[PDB]
């Protein structure tokens with residue numbers, strides 16, 4: 306056996322492990338796949354049109370001659386492969402490098418480690434107590450929020466609607482963390498779904514791994530021994546107002562009294578004007594040193610609802 | 622003249638076609654160009670194959686504009702579906718919360 | 723009072739577990755084997771230059787194992803790496819011994835058969851210390867093979883050649899059909915390799931090794947076709963949950 310010194314390595318509790326993330330995706334119903342790093346430029350140009358890729362002069366074949374600009378070409382070829390073998394429901398992920406030509410990068414090609422995946426088909430397999438329902442945007446977004454919550458920075462994540470040629474323009478979002486775009490997610494555009502011979506609605510995502518390989522180390526904060534109070538409000542705003550900005554305004558404009566803001570209903574129809582929606586929000590209030598009474602409580606939900614008057618619309 | 626004036630009134634009629642009444646303009650202009658084929662009942666017999674080739678070239682030009690308009694309408698219906706399916710991407714996703722150790 | 727009796731054997735309300743790729747299973751086991759020995763995992767880019775993939779490994783431009791290497795080149799300098807050596811060279815240049823790293827990653831070669839894919843995975847190890855010997859190479863890799871296959875199996879060390887090691891060796895496992903099966907390559911780090919990364923071969927020595935993850939995975943779980951790993955049939959992958 307080797308004789309050597311028993312010296313510890315340098316550890317960082319703020320490191321988030323990729324293997325820990327793969328485990329959560331497994332525990333949410335995702336199967337890991339590994340695909341080739343060189344792909345068919347005919348089909349990658351359908352997913353990323355106009356983006357020049359690094360080509361191999363002497364490839365094993367033309368269908369494996371373009372270094373992948375993302376993981377979507379490999380993942381979407383994998384679901385088509387499985388769907389051609391009597392398996393409509395596929396939920397897979399992959400970690401691996403992308404190769405994007407970059408004059409400022411070493412060797413003129415930037416190689417970023419990505420985490421990407423795709424789901425399609427029904428939410429569950431056939432089940433005696435679960436009904437057949439096709440997967441939608443909020444199913445994949447829920448899984449993505451579970452991944453991002455491992456960093457402890459989910460409060461600083463934003464899903465902004467943003468254009469992407471591969472995605473449904475009304476059901477696609479860019480993912481932002483502390484003002485930096487870290488990935489994309491959305492339903493595959495129906496015409497791209499047609500060209501790739503996808504069986505049905507298909508949802509993809511991709512994340513720049515190094516942007517979420519860091520996590521928050523916990524720091525114990527004092528907990529109030531005094532009870533808390535809940536007040537529900539129903540705010541009617543414009544249909545194109547993102548609900549998260551309203552929730553973020555209630556949490557920011559509110560002082561240290563309000564500790565929790567949660568959305569539990571979104572209504573639009575008989576009762577609300579066209580192009581408008583009612584958002585039912587629950588506000589939880591509490592103080593660390595004393596107990597609250599109806600005077601200061603109702604004055605704070607009144608302060609919050611008045612903040613939604615100029616920036617947004619009135620309540621009901 | 623006539624050879625293109627009838628196609629001018631044909632492509633213009635299939636331009637502002639709201640619904641799928643493109644076939645209604647197809648019906649009217651197919652009868653107009655079939656009637657123009659009946660106008661070849663005279664002329665020099667050695668040039669009658671040249672007359673039928675110019676008329677069918679005009680009919681192909683009308684059929685191309687009909688297909689191009691049918692593609693515009695079905696893409697316009699697909700775009701209308703895409704607009705109606707817009708969702709608030711900032712709404713919370715479906716999941717159970719993560720626990721810790 | 724009330725009798726709300728239910729059949730407790732009905733399937734529960736859940737979503738099925740996903741699994742890891744079988745090659746990932748293999749890489750994870752090997753990382754845990756050497757992690758207990760103080761080996762740090764190090765990764766690097768898959769596109770490299772001819773320096774970190776050849777020259778730094780004592781492979782000059784006129785060397786046979788270079789032009790006749792089934793290598794994917796983009797131009798005269800940039801290539802798809804045939805080994806994970808770039809991270810190992812950079813680590814040695816950035817610190818003096820002791821060095822104790824393992825380097826997994828994808829590598830690329832032009833061949834493509836039933837037992838060859840143009841892309842595959844390689845696990846490479848490196849240790850550099852004061853009195854690292856060939857006896858340590860044998861004992862470490864003999865321990866590794868006994869843990870990986872979980873039996874007191876027959877292995878043998880066999881003379882071979884690599885430009886970056888001397889003495890060089892390949893290790894074989896006795897196949898289930900009576901023939902020896904090449905499993906990995908290894909050797910004592912060549913003094914030229916230590917010299918050009920700023921390590922004195924008169925003071926320090928070390929051994930290194932390399933192995934294919936697809937090969938070991940096939941032998942471990944009974945996979946008979948290497949192409950199954952990259953077809954990613956959910957019925958093949960679900961067996962390894």
Ligand SMILES: C[C@@H](CC1CCCCC1)NCc1ccccc1O
Nearest residue numbers: 805807810846907908909930931932
């Ligand atoms: C290509 C080398 C690169 C390392 C060798 C010496 C130090 C630099 C990095 N991979 C490890 C290895 C070792 C022996 C035989 C085969 C083998 O694959």
